[PDB]
Design a protein around this ligand. Structure first.
Ligand SMILES: *[C@@H]1O[C@H](CO)[C@@H](O[C@@H]2O[C@H](CO)[C@@H](O[C@@H]3O[C@H](CO[C@H]4O[C@H](CO)[C@@H](O)[C@H](O[C@H]5O[C@H](CO)[C@@H](O)[C@H](O)[C@@H]5O[C@H]5O[C@H](CO)[C@@H](O)[C@H](O)[C@@H]5O)[C@@H]4O)[C@@H](O)[C@H](O[C@H]4O[C@H](CO)[C@@H](O)[C@H](O)[C@@H]4O[C@H]4O[C@H](CO)[C@@H](O)[C@H](O)[C@@H]4O)[C@@H]3O)[C@H](O)[C@H]2NC(C)=O)[C@H](O)[C@H]1NC(C)=O
Ligand SMILES: CC[C@@H](C)O/C(=C\c1ccc(Cl)cc1Cl)c1cccnc1
Ligand SMILES: [Ca+2]
Ligand SMILES: [Cl-]
Ligand SMILES: [K+]
Ligand code: NA
Ligand SMILES: [Zn+2]
Length: 802
């Protein structure tokens, strides 16, 4: 109950919100239906519209007007945004040449430049180019400030997951808003865009920017705006707050636009009806900038223009229906549309089986426009599994499509021509970033980056210490003129051992067999001491950032850090020049595994366990195919280079090692490769400890990886060989799931040249993703600045065209 009979006089858009049943005047009261009786009259004035005109100049103050054109308005902070233009012969901000803002030019009493975040729902990245003629204010911000060609949203590319990622720096799985619609089985409650439950604080995890600011003594304007408050009024409220006294005035402000998303749903991303909403957004930007210039704040404030996600063409006819696949369709609940999430309709049905649901939805129709997954098999780059609100069964829907349960759902609920929510690597889902102000750089283009990184930068802009988040703090230092954050490299926790020859052949009883001069003996000794290490370990050895027991092992062709705990390398490092040759495994060596005389029998794998384990075979981390000489090839068959692999996965691995590495070496002028295992049995994105491992090679203590990674580095200037690079680096990486079948790839019964590369592309990764998953830290010794290396570690190779 609200006693809606208090008053909003002098209280309009109160920054601090009051407790029921005393009535509310905040920009969220409308949404609770708790506004005082006089809110509309006092706070939502509209008389005479939104602009001064010639005859209104120097008028008698009429407090009923929406904005003012009287003399006292500037001191009062409530002029129409075009007042000085109309009544003082000033120019519009958009008509002024741009001029570098070297230092904040702020009124007395400002302690720090204010930050204004202007976010736009559904503003697709290509609108910056394709709408440029109808957005002159936005184009000036873009060309004069710092801009990326696009910004990558998080998955799913829905509104609330992305806006809440902007505010917190967290993946949806950590902040808890995992879709626009959700069921939490612990609360036994649902979350919907329409309605009540979404306001409850228990949905919203992490610490958003406005809370981070308040806790550290920085005042914040409110971030939520009720849909019914018009845009002009939102701008005027912000401008008013900026005229408050020093001790009351916020330092951070947010504006939100429902456009162009709302129109894009009705008309498609490039419908001819889309020109008008883009014009209207630009006009709003113009009003903010004219208003700032009037207050002498246009060279004082940092402005961020940022989207949540793009928009794709999607129509009713492009719907797959689960009833064309499932007999049992009424025993399931589907979360539908541009992604799919499936659970049992009733927890009292013990006959429900996720396994047979998956099997019934896998590769059934020749052009099937969705692919089912257990959530823990989704590409790791999506970070979409570690939340009880995310259902075990997930459908990744092809761009331009929808999934629904039954046809009745689509026609009893064609309306729409646009939608979003797809995989966050998809071009049409990309969005925008522009930063403008004294703390951003002048006329600077930066490469594409992910929206998880912005929270850190907004903290930097405000002098705040960020709450723990998924950004990599310092990786966006290159956007900023000043306020950079100068991180230090994490300290190595475990130092390696460097074992020599300590064991005789006959001490090993592993069930392994292998059919196997003074000049060339000093030679082999030195290779084992680390003579070619500078060639194969280009960027230093990775640091181990947790407590463990491991050894560095040197070889002619490769170097590895071998784990005595997991009985296999944590990492294997080798360089393949443009010139290198592929050989085959000789016949006499096909099943050869050799004891490593540097490593105890007790810290070794064994061949018998693989013979006994009918499901599990093995592969090698440094590929035998790429050995430098017949004699160096023996090193590749050491038991310390062996790892467990399902026969289905060996098909993948073998093609990557036999064909693709040489291909990248020829295309890139040499590559450096680091490969290794990953164990993530609890799908949290973080390295497992030994007590978390759920599977072992039968009869042994050999743990089974959930994934295999590789990091492939070369010279960004590809006229320099990878091993002789003077400047910036170029990287691509992957995290391949270690699966006992190839069900994920519908064409896998064909030749590896038709499906393996496509699989690897799907499972593209950031080096940073691999660091979380292994507890390692790469690129420790380069000649590049650390911030530049952090940017490189957050890079994602997406394999989309331009
Ligand atoms: C992205 O960045 C984020 C942020 O840095 C990373 O997430 C963090 O990871 C840490 C490790 O997983 C984790 O640390 C744990 O914190 C526990 C205390 O948790 C509360 O406090 C924080 C801080 O105020 C708060 O934010 C948490 O909020 C979560 O929970 C509520 C819902 O319950 C949500 O509203 C909120 O969104 C958030 O949910 C997310 O996180 C949890 C995990 O905490 C997930 O389960 C959810 O699905 C969701 O994703 C909490 O309210 C603390 O209890 C933990 O300590 C246990 O484990 C350690 C190991 O060191 C052990 O020493 C301790 O004894 C303890 O074990 C005991 O409990 C066990 C389990 O009950 C039991 O088995 C044992 O027997 C022991 O007795 C742990 O320190 C931190 O909480 C999150 N933070 C956030 C905000 O998510 C994330 O890793 C990054 N991602 C990547 C890929 O890098
Ligand atoms: C769910 C989060 C909510 C706060 O997101 C909104 C805006 C937003 C989020 C983050 C940032 Cl950095 C800036 C802005 Cl403007 C919003 C949503 C719906 C109505 N009004 C405002
Ligand atoms: Ca884990
Ligand atoms: Cl959703
Ligand atoms: K076997
Ligand atoms: Na298949
Ligand atoms: Zn939308």
């Amino acid at each position: 109950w609200t006693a809606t009979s208090g008053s909003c006089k002098g209280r309009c858009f109160e920054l601090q919100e009051v407790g029921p049943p005393d009535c509310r005047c905040d920009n969220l009261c409308k949404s609770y239906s708790s506004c005082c009786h006089d809110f509309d009259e006092l706070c939502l004035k509209t008389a005479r519209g939104w602009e001064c005109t010639k005859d209104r100049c120097g008028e008698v103050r009429n407090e009923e007007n929406a904005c003012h054109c009287s003399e006292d308005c500037l001191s009062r902070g409530d002029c129409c945004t075009n007042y000085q233009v109309v009544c003082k012969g000033e120019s519009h901000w958009v008509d002024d040449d741009c001029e570098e803002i070297k230092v904040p030019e702020c009124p007395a009493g400002f302690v720090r430049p204010p930050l204004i975040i202007f976010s736009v729902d559904g503003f697709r990245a290509s609108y910056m180019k394709k709408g440029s003629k109808v957005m002159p204010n936005i184009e000036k911000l873009r060309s004069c400030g710092t801009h990326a060609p696009y910004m990558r949203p998080v998955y799913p590319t829905k509104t609330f997951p992305n806006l809440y990622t902007l505010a917190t720096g967290l993946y949806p799985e950590s902040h808890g808003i995992v879709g626009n619609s959700m069921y939490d089985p612990v609360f036994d409650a649902s979350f919907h865009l329409r309605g009540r439950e979404k306001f409850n604080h228990r949905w919203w995890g992490g610490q958003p920017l406005w809370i981070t600011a308040t806790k550290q003594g920085v005042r914040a304007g409110t971030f939520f705006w009720s849909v019914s408050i018009p845009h002009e009024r939102r701008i005027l409220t912000i401008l008013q707050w900026l005229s408050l006294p020093d001790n009351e005035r916020p330092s951070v402000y947010a504006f939100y636009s429902e456009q162009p998303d709302f129109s894009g749903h009705k008309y498609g991303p490039f419908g001819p009806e889309m020109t008008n909403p883009l014009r209207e957004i630009d006009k709003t930007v113009g009003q903010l900038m004219d208003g700032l210039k009037q207050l002498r704040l246009h060279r004082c404030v940092n402005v961020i223009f940022v989207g949540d996600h793009g928009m794709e063409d999607v129509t009713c006819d492009r719907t797959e229906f689960l009833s064309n696949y499932l007999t049992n369709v009424d025993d399931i609940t589907l979360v539908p549309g541009t992604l799919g999430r499936i659970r049992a309709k009733s927890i009292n049905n013990s006959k429900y089986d996720p396994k047979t649901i998956i099997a019934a939805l896998t590769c059934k129709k020749p052009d099937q426009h969705f692919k089912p997954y257990m959530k823990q098999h989704l590409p790791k780059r999506l970070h979409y599994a570690n939340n009880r609100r995310i259902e075990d069964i997930h459908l990744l829907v092809d761009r331009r499509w929808h999934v629904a349960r039954k046809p009745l759902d689509v026609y009893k609920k064609c309306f729409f021509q646009g939608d979003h929510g797809f995989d966050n690597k998809v071009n049409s889902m990309q969005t925008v970033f522009v930063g403008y102000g004294p703390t951003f750089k002048y006329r600077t283009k930066v490469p594409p980056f992910e929206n998880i990184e912005l929270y850190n930068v907004m903290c930097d802009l405000l002098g705040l210490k960020p709450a723990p988040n998924n950004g990599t703090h310092g990786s966006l230092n290159h956007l900023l003129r000043t306020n950079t954050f100068r991180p230090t490299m994490p300290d190595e926790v475990s130092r390696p051992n460097y074992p020599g020859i300590m064991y005789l052949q006959s001490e090993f009883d592993l069930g392994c067999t292998c059919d196997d001069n003074k000049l060339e003996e000093l030679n082999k000794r030195l290779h084992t001491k680390g003579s070619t290490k500078e060639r194969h370990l280009l960027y230093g050895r990775p640091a181990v950032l947790y407590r463990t027991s491991y050894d560095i092992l040197y070889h002619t062709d490769f170097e590895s850090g071998y784990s005595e705990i997991f009985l296999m390398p944590l990492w294997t490092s080798y360089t393949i020049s443009k010139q290198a040759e592929v050989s085959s495994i000789p016949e006499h060596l096909t099943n050869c595994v050799r004891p490593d005389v540097r490593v105890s029998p007790g810290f070794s794998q064994n061949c018998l366990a693989y013979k006994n384990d009918k499901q599990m075979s093995y592969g090698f981390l440094f590929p035998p195919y790429l050995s430098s000489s017949p004699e160096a090839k023996y090193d590749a068959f050491l038991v310390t280079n062996m790892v467990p692999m399902y026969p289905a996965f060996k098909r993948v691995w073998a093609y990557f090692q036999r064909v693709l590495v040489k291909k990248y070496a020829s295309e890139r002028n040499g590559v450096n490769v680091i490969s290794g295992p990953i164990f993530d049995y609890n799908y949290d994105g973080l390295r497992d400890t030994e007590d978390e491992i759920k599977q072992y090679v039968e009869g042994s203590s050999i743990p089974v990886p959930t994934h295999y990674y590789s990091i492939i580095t070369s010279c960004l200037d590809f006229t320099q060989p990878a091993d002789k690079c003077d400047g910036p680096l170029s990287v691509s990486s992957f995290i391949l799931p270690h699966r006992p079948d190839n069900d994920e790839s519908c064409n896998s019964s064909e030749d590896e040249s038709k499906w393996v590369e496509e699989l690897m592309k799907m499972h593209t990764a950031r080096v940073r993703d691999i660091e979380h998953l292994t507890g390692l830290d790469f690129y420790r010794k380069t000649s590049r600045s650390y911030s530049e290396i952090l940017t490189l570690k957050t890079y994602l190779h997406t394999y989309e065209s331009e």
